[PDB]
Design an enzyme around this catalytic site. Structure first.
Site, short mmCIF file in Angstrom:
data_model
loop_
_atom_site.label_atom_id
_atom_site.label_comp_id
_atom_site.label_asym_id
_atom_site.label_seq_id
_atom_site.Cartn_x
_atom_site.Cartn_y
_atom_site.Cartn_z
N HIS A 11 32.19 -62.24 101.11
CA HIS A 11 31.35 -63.06 101.73
C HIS A 11 29.91 -62.27 102.41
N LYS A 20 16.96 -71.73 111.26
CA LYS A 20 15.91 -71.15 110.32
C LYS A 20 15.37 -72.11 109.49
N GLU A 31 28.79 -59.73 100.93
CA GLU A 31 27.74 -59.82 99.56
C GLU A 31 26.94 -61.04 99.53
N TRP A 48 34.75 -62.29 87.79
CA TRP A 48 33.96 -61.32 88.66
C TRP A 48 34.92 -60.78 89.85
N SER A 73 24.81 -47.05 94.34
CA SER A 73 23.32 -47.19 94.69
C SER A 73 23.00 -48.36 95.99
N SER A 74 23.62 -49.13 96.00
CA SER A 74 23.60 -50.09 97.06
C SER A 74 24.05 -49.47 98.46
N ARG A 133 37.93 -74.50 87.28
CA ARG A 133 36.90 -73.42 86.74
C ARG A 133 37.50 -72.45 85.59
N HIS A 138 37.63 -68.26 103.94
CA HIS A 138 37.48 -69.26 103.40
C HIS A 138 37.47 -69.42 102.09
N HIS A 139 37.55 -68.16 101.28
CA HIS A 139 37.80 -68.40 99.87
C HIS A 139 39.52 -68.11 99.83
N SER A 178 10.00 -66.78 104.57
CA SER A 178 9.22 -66.80 105.90
C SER A 178 7.89 -66.34 105.63
N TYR A 190 25.99 -62.94 101.76
CA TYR A 190 24.69 -63.24 102.70
C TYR A 190 23.92 -61.87 102.40
N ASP A 243 6.38 -42.91 102.68
CA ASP A 243 7.45 -43.13 101.70
C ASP A 243 8.85 -43.61 102.51
N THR A 248 21.44 -71.01 110.37
CA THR A 248 20.64 -71.25 109.02
C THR A 248 20.03 -72.70 109.18
N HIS A 253 28.36 -62.49 82.80
CA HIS A 253 27.38 -63.02 83.49
C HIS A 253 27.21 -63.04 84.88
C1 HEA Z 1 23.23 -64.55 90.46
C2 HEA Z 1 23.80 -65.52 90.54
C3 HEA Z 1 23.87 -66.36 89.13
C4 HEA Z 1 22.87 -66.91 88.56
C5 HEA Z 1 21.39 -67.09 88.77
C6 HEA Z 1 23.82 -67.91 87.59
C7 HEA Z 1 22.95 -68.81 86.53
C8 HEA Z 1 23.49 -69.51 85.91
N1 HEA Z 1 24.77 -69.78 85.71
FE1 HEA Z 1 26.33 -68.89 86.57
N2 HEA Z 1 27.81 -67.76 87.61
C9 HEA Z 1 27.88 -66.90 88.88
C10 HEA Z 1 26.50 -66.33 89.14
C11 HEA Z 1 25.01 -66.92 88.76
N3 HEA Z 1 24.95 -67.71 87.78
C12 HEA Z 1 28.90 -66.50 89.54
C13 HEA Z 1 29.09 -65.56 90.49
C14 HEA Z 1 30.14 -66.95 88.42
C15 HEA Z 1 31.54 -67.11 88.65
C16 HEA Z 1 32.20 -66.25 87.59
C17 HEA Z 1 33.44 -66.25 87.78
O1 HEA Z 1 33.88 -67.61 87.79
O2 HEA Z 1 34.54 -65.44 87.74
C18 HEA Z 1 29.16 -67.75 87.64
C19 HEA Z 1 29.95 -68.54 86.56
C20 HEA Z 1 29.16 -69.60 85.80
C21 HEA Z 1 29.78 -70.93 85.46
C22 HEA Z 1 31.17 -71.39 85.74
C23 HEA Z 1 32.06 -71.02 84.60
C24 HEA Z 1 33.29 -70.39 84.83
O3 HEA Z 1 33.69 -70.71 85.89
O4 HEA Z 1 33.88 -69.60 83.89
C25 HEA Z 1 28.43 -71.43 84.85
C26 HEA Z 1 28.69 -72.80 84.23
O5 HEA Z 1 28.19 -73.33 83.08
C27 HEA Z 1 27.59 -70.53 84.72
C28 HEA Z 1 26.08 -70.97 84.14
C29 HEA Z 1 25.05 -70.74 84.60
C30 HEA Z 1 23.86 -71.10 84.14
C31 HEA Z 1 23.73 -72.13 82.78
C32 HEA Z 1 22.73 -70.53 84.90
C33 HEA Z 1 21.19 -70.56 84.62
O6 HEA Z 1 21.06 -70.90 85.88
C34 HEA Z 1 20.44 -69.46 83.98
C35 HEA Z 1 19.18 -70.03 84.58
C36 HEA Z 1 18.71 -68.79 85.48
C37 HEA Z 1 17.27 -68.44 85.20
C38 HEA Z 1 16.57 -68.41 84.01
C39 HEA Z 1 16.99 -67.57 86.47
C40 HEA Z 1 15.61 -66.63 85.92
C41 HEA Z 1 16.04 -65.46 85.17
C42 HEA Z 1 15.46 -64.34 86.01
C43 HEA Z 1 15.78 -63.05 85.11
C44 HEA Z 1 14.87 -64.07 87.22
C45 HEA Z 1 13.63 -63.08 86.79
C46 HEA Z 1 12.58 -63.25 87.75
C47 HEA Z 1 12.16 -62.11 88.38
C48 HEA Z 1 12.66 -60.76 87.96
C49 HEA Z 1 11.14 -61.94 89.50
N4 HEA Z 1 27.75 -69.22 85.40
C1 HEA Z 2 23.76 -67.22 97.94
C2 HEA Z 2 24.89 -66.98 98.72
C3 HEA Z 2 25.60 -67.92 99.51
C4 HEA Z 2 25.44 -68.66 100.62
C5 HEA Z 2 24.25 -68.50 101.36
C6 HEA Z 2 26.55 -69.56 100.85
C7 HEA Z 2 26.71 -70.37 102.24
C8 HEA Z 2 27.77 -71.26 102.26
N1 HEA Z 2 28.77 -71.19 101.80
FE1 HEA Z 2 29.41 -70.41 99.97
N2 HEA Z 2 29.92 -69.44 98.09
C9 HEA Z 2 29.18 -68.54 97.48
C10 HEA Z 2 27.78 -67.96 97.95
C11 HEA Z 2 27.02 -68.41 99.04
N3 HEA Z 2 27.45 -69.35 99.73
C12 HEA Z 2 29.79 -67.73 96.30
C13 HEA Z 2 29.25 -66.84 95.38
C14 HEA Z 2 31.12 -68.58 96.17
C15 HEA Z 2 32.31 -68.32 95.26
C16 HEA Z 2 32.96 -67.29 95.34
C17 HEA Z 2 33.77 -67.30 93.98
O1 HEA Z 2 34.86 -68.11 94.17
O2 HEA Z 2 33.65 -66.99 92.93
C18 HEA Z 2 31.05 -69.54 97.38
C19 HEA Z 2 32.05 -70.15 97.64
C20 HEA Z 2 32.29 -70.93 98.82
C21 HEA Z 2 33.43 -71.29 99.68
C22 HEA Z 2 34.60 -70.66 99.10
C23 HEA Z 2 35.27 -72.00 98.48
C24 HEA Z 2 36.27 -71.85 97.44
O3 HEA Z 2 36.23 -70.77 96.60
O4 HEA Z 2 37.14 -72.61 97.15
C25 HEA Z 2 33.30 -71.86 100.90
C26 HEA Z 2 34.22 -71.96 101.88
O5 HEA Z 2 33.93 -72.38 103.11
C27 HEA Z 2 31.57 -71.80 100.99
C28 HEA Z 2 30.89 -72.10 102.07
C29 HEA Z 2 29.50 -71.84 102.56
C30 HEA Z 2 29.12 -72.21 103.96
C31 HEA Z 2 29.70 -73.05 105.11
C32 HEA Z 2 27.83 -71.73 103.69
C33 HEA Z 2 26.58 -71.78 104.79
O6 HEA Z 2 26.10 -70.50 105.05
C34 HEA Z 2 25.51 -72.96 104.37
C35 HEA Z 2 24.90 -73.20 105.76
C36 HEA Z 2 23.51 -74.07 105.34
C37 HEA Z 2 23.59 -75.31 105.74
C38 HEA Z 2 24.56 -75.80 106.13
C39 HEA Z 2 22.22 -76.12 105.31
C40 HEA Z 2 21.17 -76.19 106.06
C41 HEA Z 2 21.62 -76.65 107.70
C42 HEA Z 2 21.00 -77.62 108.32
C43 HEA Z 2 20.18 -78.66 107.45
C44 HEA Z 2 21.44 -78.03 109.52
C45 HEA Z 2 22.35 -79.09 109.92
C46 HEA Z 2 23.51 -79.11 109.06
C47 HEA Z 2 24.75 -79.19 109.62
C48 HEA Z 2 24.94 -79.24 111.04
C49 HEA Z 2 25.91 -79.01 108.71
N4 HEA Z 2 30.94 -71.45 100.03
CU LIG Z 3 31.85 -67.14 101.49
#
Ligand code: HEA
Ligand code: HEA
Ligand SMILES: [Cu+2]
Ligand SMILES: CCCCCCCCCCCCCCCC(=O)OC[C@H](COP(=O)(O)OCCN)OC(=O)CCCCCCCCCCCCCCC
Ligand SMILES: CCCCCCCCCCCCCCCC(=O)OC[C@H](COP(=O)(O)OCCN)OC(=O)CCCCCCCCCCCCCCC
Ligand SMILES: CCCCCCCCCCCCCCCC(=O)OC[C@H](COP(=O)(O)OCCN)OC(=O)CCCCCCCCCCCCCCC
Ligand SMILES: CCCCCCCCCCCCCCCC(=O)OC[C@H](COP(=O)(O)OCCN)OC(=O)CCCCCCCCCCCCCCC
Ligand SMILES: CCCCCCCCCCCCCCCC(=O)OC[C@H](COP(=O)(O)OCCN)OC(=O)CCCCCCCCCCCCCCC
Ligand code: CUA
Ligand SMILES: [Ca+2]
Ligand SMILES: [Mg+2]
Lengths: 99, 50, 534, 59, 51, 75, 236, 269
Positions: free
Chosen positions: C241, C319, C243, C127, C157-158, C438, C290-291, C256, C245, C92, C316, C62
């Site tokens: 991280h 933005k 990835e 993952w 690819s990427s 988890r 931070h992970h 935008s 962003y 192109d 952010t 997933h």
């Molecule tokens: C791309 C990021 C992404 C998205 C979209 C989702 C979507 C969903 N995910 Fe998950 N998930 C992860 C990234 C994501 N997830 C990651 C990184 C983990 C960690 C694995 C790990 O712990 O190792 C995780 C693990 C995770 C957990 C934690 C389980 C665990 O820790 O073992 C759960 C809980 O139920 C969950 C459920 C879901 C559900 C119900 C949706 C639903 O939201 C699905 C509904 C979403 C849609 C229907 C989206 C539309 C579908 C499309 C295909 C878009 C098409 C559009 C165009 C092509 C224009 N996934």
């Molecule tokens: C879509 C990708 C995405 C984005 C954009 C972010 C955005 C951020 N994430 Fe997240 N994060 C993940 C994807 C992402 N994350 C994934 C996939 C994991 C789990 C990986 C795994 O364990 O499998 C994760 C888990 C994760 C962790 C690890 C925790 C843990 O595993 O135990 C942390 C730790 O600091 C973190 C923090 C943040 C912060 C501070 C931002 C910031 O960039 C957010 C900034 C936005 C705002 C702050 C809100 C808007 C701002 C305002 C309204 C201004 C006023 C607000 C303030 C002044 C606070 N997130």
């Molecule tokens: Cu991170």
């Protein structure tokens, strides 16, 4: 006197000397421009690492200038560390016997 | 003077070899080529797994 | 037919192949999430007869499918390869055979991931494939090797597409377009490609190290032998991280564009948006531990990492305040991309605020490996990037397909996914703050109450996905009739208040990018003579 | 031996695909398709034994 | 190569002039994708004796 | 209270304490060559390594010092 | 001490670490709710007063005197939420004069506890393995996926130092109401401290994916008074 | 030129590449390589013939791709100035990606060496490991790389200066010095005490210098194809971009070999 004091800053001065030799030879190779920038970079870098490898064999020359000072290190201050870790166990054993 | 050191090392059998430390010659699974324990550039003079 | 699609060398065809693969793999990942969430609906074994290994394999599939096979090939692979040449006026991309192999190495990663599932038990490791679980002692067999090769082919690819993008927008811009006069989506793909180029090497190094540890008896992360798995955590998350962003920055560009064209006023401070995106990309390399707040670092390590993870809330925030400022004072035309953009602007900020709750390592000892983290990232993923992906589809689909979609069905689909995603991912904070860990297939019985409502919301989300499949079918079959009847919005900008309906007809499209001026479905040779700009 | 103008006059005045325009292209291209055709389908034949769990005979 | 322009010529699949209905191709393209984890589940449950 | 434990040490005041038990083990076993038997403060090292270092590691290291495979200097 | 059905808040604290974690979380959530109320109020009022606006103010692009304000104001709210976080970070790390050490070694799908202080009259190290009670042998009233056959018993009002490691894969010694979360990696020894303020029993679980028995790996800590701890330790 | 005749050309300087089979052929070769090595690593395939066939198909398909690139650049005249700038920028981004791979490997070495384990003995290089001394053969390997750069520099500038024999001979000397370095690395790998299985030291050491070894054997290959194309008059005095990329490649392999030298052989002994 000064010799070990900046011979444990040994691989932190030679990389700075490399950066100094490249970024210093850069202005001497760039002051006469008709080559493209890549040829200037590769010639300045070609001079600079001849400098760092010559300075690095001067590094091993200093390395055996310098440890006729005290022989057989890599252990004679594991001697230090173990000797006072030893009698800092001594400083605890006494006033838990008498405390 | 290193080929001659290997020359005199060819006369030292494996019970006179120094025993390998814990980290030396890791064998998780056998290598998929050859006979098992021998690696890609395994010179049997300088390398020995007992 | 074989030379246009197998031997392909134009970017607009490789983009729709990317899009077909992305939506196929998204159906796969959504099915996997439906199975996960159906098993998690109630305590005890429900659908998989015990067998927690199969649960873990499905979680791996997933995550990997939705990240590396839906969001990246959808956003970067489809939208970048389609739109960045059209928005910089390039004929192109530079290096087009590279651009074709960067697609065709993705079905091969897909088939090796699927047979990774079908061999001995699958790779149930998360993952983030951590050793020593991902080693040869704890995972015997070719499962993890094939998963690592799936990651290798996706990284190939990427990386090739990133090189392609960097060179084609530094070199093939049309003849009035300086770098300051770029559209924001081009800056998104540009900064994303640099993050890819700088981050994918360390991932490839780490998982090749893992593969050699598994198969070639070498010891990078084997403790009996001198290794350390914290080295794997560092080398992984230095990619991990950047990835995430990478996943969000093209979403920022799509939002935008959408927000400005449906507010009918330009983006408030565009160059500060470019600076903010570049600062997010630069600062994303400084926050990777931070992970790793729990693994046993120093206190000064964790103090710096809370500081650096905290100071990415500033660009952010710039933005998001700029998005609110560029909808303030506008003339909002509530179409489906605008609905998705407003939902982005709410739910992404909620995910970011839980992110700054997680940024404090003082507090992350209460939330690490809980479902709170799952709530944070599924907010900013399936409501940030998926909502911007849906916005990009509903924003560009009738232009680049030539066929309009049903507008009422699109808004029904939006409201269903906006309800369903909230119902899945909002109770996960409650579960995580009460201590639910988890990656568990079964939980104590006190966690049943929010798990049930989450898996009820899962069915709403997949029902809206099925509705989206029907919307695609109705667009492909009846898309020429949707222009004739009133089932669709034909013009995404209404006339201005004093603009006549006949004076609107000579200037039907009013855009700040070339994409909406082209012929519908755009020509195989767009830009024979180059476009020109003051 | 400086055949480059003579080869330009062939590669530009030709109808065949670019990997076929050299005179010696039938010597490269016909073996390669056979070697490629066995190289891509022989692991696909071993995929079912890897699913079932049957290892090959080595002893 | 000069390729055809138009409305339906940008997609690798055929929509309009077909001897079979298009919904066959369309919904069987997505049902296979929705059905890969069920094939996965079936074979990893038959390997573990649950069936 | 009869409860007494290893206190924190200025060499290792952070979270990781691997080189607390390993250092106190190698310090104990390189006592008894230079120090000998029945020496009163090499039970400081003994309490320090057996209070915070796990049993698998202790018996592995004692096996390794009977091997000649121990990676410290206790001879 | 135990999760409750439909809960939405932390478990009830038992250490000063967890009671500080709760206060820092609430202090962060204060300003977080301020910012959420601001942006949700703007997002409501803008689309409810400009959806019906037919003239768009298309010449508002710069705003110089307020871009600096919404750059500066997030920074000072980061400073305000970062002031107590650093204090808690540099308070929770010191393990100063503990009265007890306990080692916790995570094997694959059991924990192994080891009191190693020789305060006993036996004078030997106390170790035991604590397995999950399986679902078929749960006697009536026991908590599923939380109860174990043996328990980790700790006195109250005592600085305890948990030294945490593993044996084969990475585990996580985690108890939320005590507020300890510490990764057990098979190479190294981490430490946390606690001071239990109230008697009771506190549950936790392995919060790191160990494999196929990851859900079946719980932690159970009985905190008793020091007489009852001593009479427990006199057997095992 | 007139409008009628200007209309028979491209109006923009960029290469519109003809459709080509080698992307999908190399993709299927990478598939066969992955599926062959993941099954020979675990015994589901008898011998290494499938992996050998897959690597051979991969190499020959890359060779046919490069043959088509040579054909486009020389026999069709498709590489204008903008295309040259783009190819140079793409190769620079490529070598930045590979420098970052080496930075990950240097991170692995430093994380193992800055504070080592207790299972090696708080020691670096670990106990029992007989480290490679930096004075004997790796000093000659630094010398024949700093000299190979000096040869290829005059070979390049004599290619620009109109000389033919002074450029071909310098390219030949560069190629032979690179294969001298590769055979000296093979001799070191044979007469090395530790192997890749001898702990984390052998792991990080052979990982770094073996990745450098693989980059050097590809460097010898591209120096050979540059000699072929210079002898057969493909390379010209103003338009030699594959040669320029090879020069960039030599001069980055030189500096990363120096970092490997001073880290793996001087600081780490
Ligand atoms: C791309 C990021 C992404 C998205 C979209 C989702 C979507 C969903 N995910 Fe998950 N998930 C992860 C990234 C994501 N997830 C990651 C990184 C983990 C960690 C694995 C790990 O712990 O190792 C995780 C693990 C995770 C957990 C934690 C389980 C665990 O820790 O073992 C759960 C809980 O139920 C969950 C459920 C879901 C559900 C119900 C949706 C639903 O939201 C699905 C509904 C979403 C849609 C229907 C989206 C539309 C579908 C499309 C295909 C878009 C098409 C559009 C165009 C092509 C224009 N996934
Ligand atoms: C879509 C990708 C995405 C984005 C954009 C972010 C955005 C951020 N994430 Fe997240 N994060 C993940 C994807 C992402 N994350 C994934 C996939 C994991 C789990 C990986 C795994 O364990 O499998 C994760 C888990 C994760 C962790 C690890 C925790 C843990 O595993 O135990 C942390 C730790 O600091 C973190 C923090 C943040 C912060 C501070 C931002 C910031 O960039 C957010 C900034 C936005 C705002 C702050 C809100 C808007 C701002 C305002 C309204 C201004 C006023 C607000 C303030 C002044 C606070 N997130
Ligand atoms: Cu991170
Ligand atoms: C990693 C794979 C290697 C990437 C090299 C990129 C070089 C940048 C560049 O300059 O690429 C230019 C050429 C592609 O040119 P093209 O045919 O797309 O351009 C048309 C203009 N003549 O590179 C290549 O032949 C790359 C060949 C890669 C073979 C697959 C290897 C997979 C591993
Ligand atoms: C049972 C499932 C739900 C049935 C909906 C009944 C609609 C009633 C009706 O018949 O509705 C009539 C309308 C008329 O359509 P209109 O908007 O053109 O007219 C507007 C008049 N003012 O059709 C619709 O809008 C709805 C059509 C959508 C139906 C969804 C089809 C099923 C989607 C899931 C299956 C496909 C994916 C599966 C493959 C993975
Ligand atoms: C504490 C900060 C929190 C910020 C929260 C973010 C809110 C985002 C949504 C609201 C954005 C408003 C639109 C952008 C501002 C704008 O329109 O700027 C364009 C004009 C400038 O143009 P002028 O030269 O004609 O005016 C000359 C006057 N300088 O400035 C304005 O009219 C608003 C001025 C606001 C003054 C500060 C108010 C702070 C309270
Ligand atoms: C792709 C991008 C990611 C790259 C990540 C790092 C790649 C590492 C390259 C491995 C080269 C190691 C090597 O060449 O080591 C040489 C070793 C053999 O040497 P020996 O130990 O027998 O010799 C010492 C005898 N006295 O070969 C191997 O056993 C492994 C071969 C397969 C490597 C792949
Ligand atoms: C695997 C083996 C790698 C050997 C690469 C040799 C490239 C030969 C093709 C060539 O050299 O292409 C020649 C062209 C330009 O030719 P020109 O303008 O100099 O011709 C002059 C006519 N007057 O250079 C390029 O496109 C760039 C080549 C970059 C190749 C990088 C490949 C990296 C692969 C990593 C995996
Ligand atoms: Cu132990 Cu999960
Ligand atoms: Ca369940
Ligand atoms: Mg974790």
């Amino acid at each position: 006197k000064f010799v070990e004091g900046l011979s444990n800053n040994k691989y932190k001065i030679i990389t700075g000397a490399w950066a100094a030799s490249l970024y210093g030879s850069w202005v001497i190779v760039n002051k006469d421009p008709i080559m493209t920038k890549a040829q200037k970079i590769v010639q300045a870098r070609m001079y600079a690492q001849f400098i760092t490898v010559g300075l690095l064999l001067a590094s091993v020359g200093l390395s055996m200038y310098e440890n006729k000072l005290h022989p057989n290190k890599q252990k004679v201050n594991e001697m230090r560390r173990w000797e006072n870790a030893l009698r800092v166990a001594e400083e605890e054993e006494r006033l838990e016997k008498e405390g | 003077e290193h080929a001659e050191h290997r020359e005199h090392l060819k006369h030292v059998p494996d019970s006179e070899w120094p025993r390998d430390y814990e980290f030396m010659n890791i064998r998780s699974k056998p290598f998929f080529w050859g006979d098992g324990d021998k690696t890609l550039f395994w010179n049997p003079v300088v390398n020995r797994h007992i | 037919m074989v030379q246009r699609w197998l031997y392909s060398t134009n970017a607009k065809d490789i983009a729709v192949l990317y899009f077909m693969l992305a939506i196929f793999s998204g159906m796969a990942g959504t099915a996997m999430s439906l199975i996960i969430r159906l098993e998690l609906a109630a305590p005890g074994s429900q659908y998989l007869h015990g067998n927690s290994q199969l649960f873990n394999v499905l979680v791996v599939g997933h995550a990997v499918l939705m990240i590396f096979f839906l969001v990246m090939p959808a956003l970067i692979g489809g939208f970048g390869n389609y739109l960045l040449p059209l928005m910089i006026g390039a004929t192109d991309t530079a290096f087009p055979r590279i651009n074709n192999i960067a697609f065709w190495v993705l079905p091969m990663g897909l088939v090796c991931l699927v047979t990774s599932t079908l061999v001995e038990s699958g790779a149930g490791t998360g993952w983030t494939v951590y050793p020593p679980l991902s080693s040869i002692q704890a995972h015997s067999g070719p499962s993890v090797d094939l998963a690592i090769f799936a990651l290798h082919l996706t990284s190939i690819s990427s990386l090739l597409g990133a090189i392609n993008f960097i060179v084609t927008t530094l070199n093939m811009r049309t003849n009035g377009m300086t770098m300051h006069k770029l559209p924001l989506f081009v800056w998104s793909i540009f900064i994303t490609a640099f993050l890819l180029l700088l981050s994918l090497p360390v991932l490839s190094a780490g998982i090749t190290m893992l593969l050699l540890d598994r198969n070639f008896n070498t010891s990078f992360f084997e403790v009996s032998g001198g290794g350390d798995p914290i080295l794997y955590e560092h080398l992984f998350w230095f990619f991990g991280h950047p990835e995430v962003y990478i996943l969000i920055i093209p979403g920022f560009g799509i939002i935008s564009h959408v927000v400005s064209t449906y507010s009918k006023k330009p983006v408030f401070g565009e160059i500060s948006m470019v600076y903010a995106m570049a600062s997010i990309g630069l600062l994303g390399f400084l926050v990777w531990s931070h992970h790793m707040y729990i693994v046993g670092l120093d206190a000064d390590t964790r103090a710096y990492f809370t500081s650096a993870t905290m100071i990415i809330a500033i660009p952010t925030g710039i933005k998001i305040f700029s998005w609110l400022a560029t909808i303030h004072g506008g003339s909002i035309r509530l179409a489906t991309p605008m609905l998705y953009a407003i939902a982005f602007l709410f739910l992404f900020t909620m995910g970011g605020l839980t992110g700054v709750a997680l940024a404090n390592a003082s507090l992350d000892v209460a939330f690490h490996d809980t479902y709170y983290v799952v709530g944070h990232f599924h907010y900013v993923l399936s409501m940030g990037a998926i909502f911007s992906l849906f916005a990009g589809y509903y924003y560009w689909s009738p232009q680049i397909l030539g066929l309009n979609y049903n507008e009422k069905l699109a808004q029904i689909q939006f409201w269903l996914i906006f309800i369903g995603a909230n119902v899945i991912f909002f109770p996960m904070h409650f579960l995580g703050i009460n201590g639910m860990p988890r990656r568990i297939p079964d939980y104590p019985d006190a966690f049943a109450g929010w798990n049930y409502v989450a898996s009820i919301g899962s069915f709403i989300a997949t029902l809206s996905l099925f509705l989206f499949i029907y919307i695609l079918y109705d667009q492909l079959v009846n898309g020429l009739n949707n222009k004739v009847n009133n089932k669709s919005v034909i013009y995404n900008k209404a006339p201005d208040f004093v603009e006549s309906n006949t004076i609107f007809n000579l200037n039907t499209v009013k855009s700040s990018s070339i994409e909406f001026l082209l012929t519908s479905p755009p020509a195989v040779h767009s830009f024979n003579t180059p476009a020109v700009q003051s | 031996a400086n055949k480059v103008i003579q080869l330009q006059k062939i590669f530009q005045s030709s109808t065949k695909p670019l990997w076929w325009r050299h005179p010696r292209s039938a010597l490269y291209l016909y073996p390669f398709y056979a070697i490629f055709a066995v190289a891509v389908v022989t692991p696909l034949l071993y995929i079912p034994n890897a699913i079932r769990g049957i290892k090959a005979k080595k002893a | 190569v000069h390729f055809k322009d138009g409305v339906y010529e940008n997609i690798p699949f055929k929509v309009k002039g077909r001897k079979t209905p298009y919904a066959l191709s369309h919904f069987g393209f997505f049902a296979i994708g929705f059905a890969v984890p069920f094939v996965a589940c079936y074979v990893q449950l038959k390997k573990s004796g649950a069936f | 209270s009869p409860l007494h434990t290893v206190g924190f040490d200025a060499r290792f005041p952070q979270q990781n304490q691997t080189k607390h038990c390993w250092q106190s083990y190698v310090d104990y076993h390189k006592c008894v060559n230079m120090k000998g038997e029945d020496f009163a403060p090499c039970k400081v090292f003994w309490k320090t390594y057996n209070a915070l270092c796990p049993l698998d590691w202790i018996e592995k290291w004692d096996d390794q010092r009977e091997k000649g495979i121990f990676a410290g200097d206790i001879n | 001490d135990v999760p409750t059905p439909y809960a939405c808040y932390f478990q009830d604290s038992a250490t000063p670490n967890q009671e500080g974690i709760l206060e820092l979380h609430d202090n962060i959530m204060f300003y977080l709710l301020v910012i959420l109320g601001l942006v949700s109020w703007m997002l409501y009022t803008i689309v409810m007063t400009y959806s019906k606006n037919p003239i768009a103010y298309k010449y508002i692009k710069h705003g110089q005197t307020i871009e600096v304000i919404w750059t500066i104001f997030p920074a000072v709210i980061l400073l305000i939420i970062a002031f107590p976080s650093f204090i808690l970070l540099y308070l929770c790390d010191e393990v100063i004069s503990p009265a007890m050490t306990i080692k916790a070694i995570g094997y694959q799908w059991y924990w192994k506890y080891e009191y190693s202080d020789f305060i006993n009259d036996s004078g030997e190290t106390v170790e035991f393995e604590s397995y999950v009670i399986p679902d078929e042998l749960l006697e009536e009233g026991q908590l599923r996926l939380l109860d174990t056959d043996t328990s980790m018993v700790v006195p109250v009002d005592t600085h305890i130092r948990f030294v945490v490691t593993a044996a084969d894969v990475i585990h996580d010694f985690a108890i939320p109401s005590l507020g300890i979360k510490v990764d057990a990696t098979p190479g190294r020894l981490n430490q946390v401290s606690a001071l239990i303020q109230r008697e009771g029993v506190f549950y936790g679980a392995c919060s790191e994916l160990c494999g196929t028995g990851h859900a079946n790996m719980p932690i159970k800590i009985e905190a008793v008074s020091l007489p009852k701890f001593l009479e427990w330790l006199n057997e095992q | 030129m007139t409008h009628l005749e200007r209309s028979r050309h491209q109006q923009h300087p960029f290469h519109m590449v003809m459709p080509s089979p080698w992307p999908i052929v190399v993709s299927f070769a990478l598939l066969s390589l992955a599926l062959s090595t993941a099954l020979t690593m675990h015994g589901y395939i008898g011998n290494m013939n499938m992996v050998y066939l897959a690597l051979f198909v991969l190499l020959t398909s890359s060779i046919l791709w490069f043959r088509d690139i040579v054909a486009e650049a020389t026999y069709l005249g498709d590489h204008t100035m903008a295309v040259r700038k783009g190819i140079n920028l793409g190769f620079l981004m490529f070598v930045l990606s590979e420098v970052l791979i080496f930075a990950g490997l240097f991170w692995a070495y430093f994380h193992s060496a800055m504070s080592p384990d207790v299972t090696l003995g708080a020691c670096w290089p670990p106990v029992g490991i007989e480290a490679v001394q930096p004075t004997e053969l790796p000093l000659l390997n630094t010398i024949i790389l700093l000299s190979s750069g000096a040869t290829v520099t005059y070979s390049h500038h004599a290619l620009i200066a109109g000389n033919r024999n002074k450029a071909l001979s310098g390219l030949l000397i560069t190629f032979w010095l690179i294969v001298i370095f590769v055979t000296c690395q093979y001799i070191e790998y044979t007469n090395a005490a530790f192997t890749i299985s001898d702990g984390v030291y052998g792991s990080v050491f052979y990982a770094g210098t073996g990745l450098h070894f693989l980059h050097m054997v590809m460097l010898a290959a591209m120096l050979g194809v540059n000699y072929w194309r210079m002898r057969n008059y493909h390379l010209t005095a103003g338009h030699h971009v594959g040669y320029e990329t090879t020069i960039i490649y030599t001069h980055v392999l030189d500096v990363i070999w120096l970092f490997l030298y001073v880290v793996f052989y001087w600081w780490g002994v």
